[PDB]
Amino acid sequence: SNMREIAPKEFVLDMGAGWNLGNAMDTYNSDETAWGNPLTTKAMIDEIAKMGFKTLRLPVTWKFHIGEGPDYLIEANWLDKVEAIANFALENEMYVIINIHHDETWILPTYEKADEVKDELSKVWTQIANRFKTYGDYLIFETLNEPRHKGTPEEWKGGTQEGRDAVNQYHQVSVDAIRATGGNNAKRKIMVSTYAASTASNALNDYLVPNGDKNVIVSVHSYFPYQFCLDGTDSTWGTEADKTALLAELDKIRDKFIVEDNRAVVMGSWGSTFSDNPEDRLAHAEFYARACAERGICPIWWDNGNVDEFGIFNRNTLEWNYPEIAEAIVK
Amino acid sequence: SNMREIAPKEFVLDMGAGWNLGNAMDTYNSDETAWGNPLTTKAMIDEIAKMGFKTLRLPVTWKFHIGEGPDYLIEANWLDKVEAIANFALENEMYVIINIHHDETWILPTYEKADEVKDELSKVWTQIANRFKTYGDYLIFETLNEPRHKGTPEEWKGGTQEGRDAVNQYHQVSVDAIRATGGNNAKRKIMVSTYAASTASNALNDYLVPNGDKNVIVSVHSYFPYQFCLDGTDSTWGTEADKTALLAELDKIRDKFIVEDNRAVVMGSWGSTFSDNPEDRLAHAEFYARACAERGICPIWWDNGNVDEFGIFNRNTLEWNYPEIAEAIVK
Amino acid sequence: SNMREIAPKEFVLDMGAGWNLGNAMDTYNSDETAWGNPLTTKAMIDEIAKMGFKTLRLPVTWKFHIGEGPDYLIEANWLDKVEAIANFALENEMYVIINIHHDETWILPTYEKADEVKDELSKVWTQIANRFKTYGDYLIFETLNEPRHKGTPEEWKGGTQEGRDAVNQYHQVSVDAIRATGGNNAKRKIMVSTYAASTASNALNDYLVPNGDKNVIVSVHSYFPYQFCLDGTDSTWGTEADKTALLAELDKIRDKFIVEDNRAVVMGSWGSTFSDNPEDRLAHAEFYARACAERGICPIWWDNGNVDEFGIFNRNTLEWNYPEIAEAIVK
Numbered sequence: 002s003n004m005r006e007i008a009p010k011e012f013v014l015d016m017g018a019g020w021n022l023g024n025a026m027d028t029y030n031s032d033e034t035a036w037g038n039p040l041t042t043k044a045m046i047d048e049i050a051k052m053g054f055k056t057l058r059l060p061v062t063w064k065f066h067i068g069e070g071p072d073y074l075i076e077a078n079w080l081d082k083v084e085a086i087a088n089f090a091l092e093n094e095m096y097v098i099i100n101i102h103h104d105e106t107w108i109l110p111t112y113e114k115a116d117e118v119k120d121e122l123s124k125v126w127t128q129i130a131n132r133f134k135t136y137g138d139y140l141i142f143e144t145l146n147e148p149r150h151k152g153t154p155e156e157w158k159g160g161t162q163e164g165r166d167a168v169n170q171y172h173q174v175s176v177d178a179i180r181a182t183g184g185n186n187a188k189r190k191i192m193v194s195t196y197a198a199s200t201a202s203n204a205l206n207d208y209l210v211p212n213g214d215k216n217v218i219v220s221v222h223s224y225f226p227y228q229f230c231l232d233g234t235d236s237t238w239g240t241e242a243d244k245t246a247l248l249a250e251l252d253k254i255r256d257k258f259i260v261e262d263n264r265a266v267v268m269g270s271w272g273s274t275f276s277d278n279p280e281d282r283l284a285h286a287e288f289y290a291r292a293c294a295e296r297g298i299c300p301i302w303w304d305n306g307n308v309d310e311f312g313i314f315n316r317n318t319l320e321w322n323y324p325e326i327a328e329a330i331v332k
Numbered sequence: 333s334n335m336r337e338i339a340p341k342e343f344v345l346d347m348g349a350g351w352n353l354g355n356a357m358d359t360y361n362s363d364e365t366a367w368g369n370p371l372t373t374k375a376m377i378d379e380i381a382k383m384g385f386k387t388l389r390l391p392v393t394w395k396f397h398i399g400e401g402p403d404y405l406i407e408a409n410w411l412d413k414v415e416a417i418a419n420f421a422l423e424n425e426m427y428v429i430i431n432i433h434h435d436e437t438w439i440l441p442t443y444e445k446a447d448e449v450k451d452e453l454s455k456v457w458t459q460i461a462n463r464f465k466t467y468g469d470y471l472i473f474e475t476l477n478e479p480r481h482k483g484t485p486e487e488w489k490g491g492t493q494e495g496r497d498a499v500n501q502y503h504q505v506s507v508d509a510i511r512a513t514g515g516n517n518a519k520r521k522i523m524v525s526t527y528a529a530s531t532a533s534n535a536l537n538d539y540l541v542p543n544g545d546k547n548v549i550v551s552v553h554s555y556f557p558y559q560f561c562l563d564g565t566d567s568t569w570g571t572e573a574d575k576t577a578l579l580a581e582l583d584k585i586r587d588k589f590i591v592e593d594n595r596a597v598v599m600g601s602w603g604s605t606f607s608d609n610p611e612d613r614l615a616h617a618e619f620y621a622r623a624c625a626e627r628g629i630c631p632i633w634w635d636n637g638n639v640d641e642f643g644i645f646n647r648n649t650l651e652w653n654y655p656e657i658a659e660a661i662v663k
Numbered sequence: 664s665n666m667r668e669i670a671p672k673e674f675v676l677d678m679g680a681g682w683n684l685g686n687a688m689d690t691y692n693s694d695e696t697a698w699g700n701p702l703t704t705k706a707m708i709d710e711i712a713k714m715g716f717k718t719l720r721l722p723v724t725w726k727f728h729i730g731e732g733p734d735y736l737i738e739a740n741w742l743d744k745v746e747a748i749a750n751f752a753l754e755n756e757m758y759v760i761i762n763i764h765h766d767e768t769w770i771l772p773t774y775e776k777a778d779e780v781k782d783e784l785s786k787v788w789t790q791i792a793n794r795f796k797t798y799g800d801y802l803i804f805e806t807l808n809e810p811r812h813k814g815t816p817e818e819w820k821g822g823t824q825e826g827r828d829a830v831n832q833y834h835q836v837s838v839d840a841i842r843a844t845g846g847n848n849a850k851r852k853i854m855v856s857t858y859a860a861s862t863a864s865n866a867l868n869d870y871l872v873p874n875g876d877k878n879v880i881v882s883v884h885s886y887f888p889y890q891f892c893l894d895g896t897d898s899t900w901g902t903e904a905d906k907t908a909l910l911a912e913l914d915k916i917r918d919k920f921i922v923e924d925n926r927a928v929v930m931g932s933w934g935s936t937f938s939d940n941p942e943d944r945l946a947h948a949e950f951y952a953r954a955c956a957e958r959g960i961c962p963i964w965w966d967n968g969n970v971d972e973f974g975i976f977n978r979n980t981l982e983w984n985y986p987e988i989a990e991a992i993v994k
């Protein structure tokens with residue numbers, strides 16, 4: 002229940018390294034087990050903590066448990082599930098990040114939809130914030146995961162000018178709704194993303210922190226380089242050129258947010274999918290996490306529980322599939 | 333004239349141990365003999381090489397030999413003197429470091445002065461770099477000795493936030509000016525310092541390598557512990573606590589620059605002033621150099637030519653005043 | 664249970680020649696018979712003493728009998744087994760060395776693990792030391808067998824710089840824990856190893872005796888030459904080149920520890936695996952032991968109880984499998 006006097010820069014260093022409980026509560030289905038992961042237990046989270054991860058990101062997709070508007074009431078039972086998992090992490094002395102994840106179907110960033118979306122978001126973030134209001138500063142809110150216009154040609158290229166405008170407004174309404182509930186929520190750290198959590202120059206240039214709020218942290222995701230990390234079109238990593246380009250991606254993030262804007266940055270998702278390339282994945286993970294540490298950025302590995310993809314921890318056995326990667330990330 | 337394909341960490345190991353030609357071309361007077369040292373000769377430098385030092389640091393104060401703006405022309409004769417001394421060392425197969433030394437009167441790190449300073453520095457480093465363009469990779473440039481705001485309370489405590497920002501900008505302009513002259517200067521190793529070459533946490537945290545340039549080496553100076561080394565308030569050295577603390581100062585340097593940032597480090601100045609304690613000075617020198625060698629740091633002893641202070645070599649007779657200290661440094 | 668005034672040099676001469684009770688209490692299994700040796704009896708030890716061995720090395724692996732943190736309690740019954748075997752030897756007028764053996768899984772020499780490891784080691788050595796506090800100076804503690812980072816490329820090549828640093832710290836904590844229990848443990852001889860008990864130049868150079876404690880003896884193991892002794896890739900021994908090189912390995916040990924450092928040295932493990940080469944094994948054993956005796960080094964043969972490997976004594980029948988080797992060692 003305690004709130005410290007701690008600037009975002011120092012707070013993000015104290016966050017250490019993080020791990021995502023991916024494809025669990027973020028699962029796009031009313032049943033959170035539908036994407037192949039079991040109901041999350043304390044024993045799973047205990048292992049994450051023991052490995053040395055200081056932050057748990059707890060992504061949550063709310064769509065299937067929001068009732069009809071005008072109220073848009075969140076099922077109390079669904080909040081109970083989120084709350085229990087959060088406590089598994091807080092008990093382990095970990096930071097916990099709770100977000101709005103695969104909810105883009107009702108978070109459409111167009112001027113036409115803005116008032117409707119703002120209204121629903123406002124009511125939803127009000128209810129999430131109210132439920133977690135008494136918690137201390139180890140609990141962090143992240144307003145929107147990768148807010149964007151699904152299906153459009155600019156979805157993954159920093160959006161349109163209109164897209165970026167509406168996303169800043171959606172963050173505005175979400176931050177205000179959280180702050181307005183008062184208590185610890187007046188001062189709680191809040192992670193605010195760029196459009197789609199993109200690092201493209203256009204997304205960076207139109208980024209706005211709501212109210213210049215001094216307790217807002219920047220959220221970007223950078224699966225760099227995407228050919229290796231996401232597409233599987235490249236399975237090799239480690240040449241000078243690989244290293245130089247990654248450093249240049251992280252320098253662009255530092256120069257803009259940290260140096261020029263005096264903000265802290267959480268890389269709330271990154272990692273590489275498995276492509277029969279364990280040596281390269283390890284080298285990439287070690288290098289990426291070290292480069293983030295050098296720049297004061299908190300790196301949070303994306304784990305979807307599937308060993309053939311992003312899974313480095315076996316949730317069923319509680320053994321690490323790729324403990325080397327884990328050990329490299331938390332160094 | 334040759335430039336090898338050689339990473340900084342390996343280059344710094346090859347630098348071995350170094351010795352400073354202090355109070356010579358760095359002398360704050362139009363006459364470089366005014367601080368008690370003679371005009372430097374090849375025979376002096378031969379002895380430095382014969383003793384086993386592999387690196388000569390050739391500090392240079394340029395103030396008395398720079399013309400008025402807007403050109404800020406460096407006297408050609410002064411460049412000739414620097415060049416001759418450099419060749420004394422290169423002929424002995426030693427590395428040689430050329431810098432900008434006691435020039436803080438026109439290198440004021442304030443926002444107010446930044447544009448005037450950047451302009452002059454750019455023009456001055458352009459001229460130094462052009463004169464030495466054809467030299468091979470045994471010749472190293474160090475952009476700024478101990479850049480700082482003289483007189484301020486934070487001068488020797490890592491500066492102000494403003495101080496540190498202006499110093500990073502000054503390094504930026506200097507590195508760019510060197511690189512822009514092309515030739516061997518495209519790939520030559522450059523030593524870039526923290527504010528005042530300080531190892532204080534603040535100076536370490538705000539340090540930026542211009543452009544992430546991969547041929548930049550970190551420069552810090554650590555006269556550790558200062559009470560023994562500089563102030564003469566303590567003349568004893570060798571307890572467990574003395575050793576442990578020195579190891580901890582060097583570990584802080586390694587952990588930040590070498591491990592976390594993947595940079596090489598030249599300790600371009602360190603040593604102890606004479607305080608009627610030859611046994612302690614020797615033990616300190618042996619221990620400090622060994623600890624640097626074990627961490628891959630190049631140690632360069634500060635010698636001001638005065639046997640009652642930092643002088644371990646007699647420049648007049650070409651005999652060593654304290655050969656044991658020299659022999660302990662070179663391993 | 665008396666403590667003599669006896670310097671390490673004289674103590675090591677009095678230790679004579681030794682034999683290891685290998686693959687017994689050091690066995691990496693909850694059951695100490697799992698590696699093919701029976702429960703050790705006084706009648707076995709009587710034969711070791713009768714043959715002329717003056718020292719018994721009693722290696723002990725503790726892992727399977729240490730309870731959970733934070734106490735890390737050693738099973739009293741396991742200590743009783745160690746104690747009984749020790750007394751078998753003490754009753755025979757022998758020295759006995761008790762160690763920590765195949766316990767590298769919780770003694771990981773990295774900076775990351777150092778605090779966790781130091782804490783456990785401190786508590787474990789405190790309990791071993793307390794159990795044996797009243798014993799006289801015929802009982803010797805050896806802090807760590809072959810401490811190292813298992814699996815790494817430098818495991819058997821003297822470690823990394825980090826490896827060696829962490830091992831010196833582990834020895835520091837272990838020696839301090841023993842000394843702090845007081846009584847006879849203030850003055851008991853303690854054998855302190857290099858990294859992996861290696862004689863590689865890097866392991867030798869970074870070796871530190873905790874506190875310069877004057878009752879610490881050096882522990883190194885040198886299965887020289889390893890091609891003959893360990894790998895079985897060479898089965899011949901006895902040329903002048905074989906002899907000259909072995910003499911040079913032992914001179915390197917003498918020159919560093921005995922002459923330059925004024926320390927005593929126990930070669931706590933050496934020997935040769937059987938390679939269908941009895942005549943050569945004998946010649947090697949005779950020569951190696953004589954060369955150790957001439958240098959004041961105590962040689963202790965490694966015996967794993969398996970006649971096809973290092974076993975020269977039959978523990979089941981109490982007959983010697985290779986009495987010639989034993990006689991050559993103790994001569």
Ligand SMILES: OC[C@H]1O[C@@H](O[C@H]2[C@H](O)[C@@H](O)[C@H](O[C@H]3[C@H](O)[C@@H](O)[C@@H](O)O[C@@H]3CO)O[C@@H]2CO)[C@H](O)[C@@H](O)[C@@H]1O
Nearest residue numbers: 023024027035036037146147222270271303305310311
């Ligand atoms: O296999 C089960 C299920 O997977 C669904 O795809 C998931 C991926 O498994 C998951 O890795 C990915 O995670 C992304 C995360 O949600 C984003 O925030 C961002 O960080 O990028 C991550 C990596 O792409 O999410 C997708 C869903 O978008 C399939 O869609 C589904 O068919 C399948 O059953």
Ligand SMILES: OC[C@H]1O[C@@H](O[C@H]2[C@H](O)[C@@H](O)[C@H](O[C@H]3[C@H](O)[C@@H](O)[C@@H](O)O[C@@H]3CO)O[C@@H]2CO)[C@H](O)[C@@H](O)[C@@H]1O
Nearest residue numbers: 354355358366367368477478553601602634636641642
């Ligand atoms: O006695 C000659 C002259 O000395 C000046 O002091 C010199 C010191 O002799 C010299 O040791 C010192 O060196 C410093 C070096 O320049 C710095 O880069 C850093 O490494 O610290 C060194 C040790 O302090 O420099 C000073 C000059 O600042 C006197 O100022 C002068 O009055 C006197 O005539």
Ligand SMILES: OC[C@H]1O[C@@H](O[C@H]2[C@H](O)[C@@H](O)[C@H](O[C@H]3[C@H](O)[C@@H](O)[C@@H](O)O[C@@H]3CO)O[C@@H]2CO)[C@H](O)[C@@H](O)[C@@H]1O
Nearest residue numbers: 685686689698699808809884932933965967969972973
């Ligand atoms: O007996 C079968 C059992 O043996 C295990 O290997 C043992 C060797 O038998 C033993 O000789 C060897 O001894 C080493 C000693 O422990 C070290 O301190 C050092 O002095 O080197 C000695 C020579 O190697 O230890 C090994 C274990 O590390 C097998 O591992 C096991 O699979 C098998 O069942």
Ligand SMILES: [Mg+2]
Nearest residue numbers: 235236237238
């Ligand atoms: Mg590739």
Ligand SMILES: [Mg+2]
Nearest residue numbers: 566567568569
């Ligand atoms: Mg002192």
Ligand SMILES: [Mg+2]
Nearest residue numbers: 897898899900
């Ligand atoms: Mg042979």
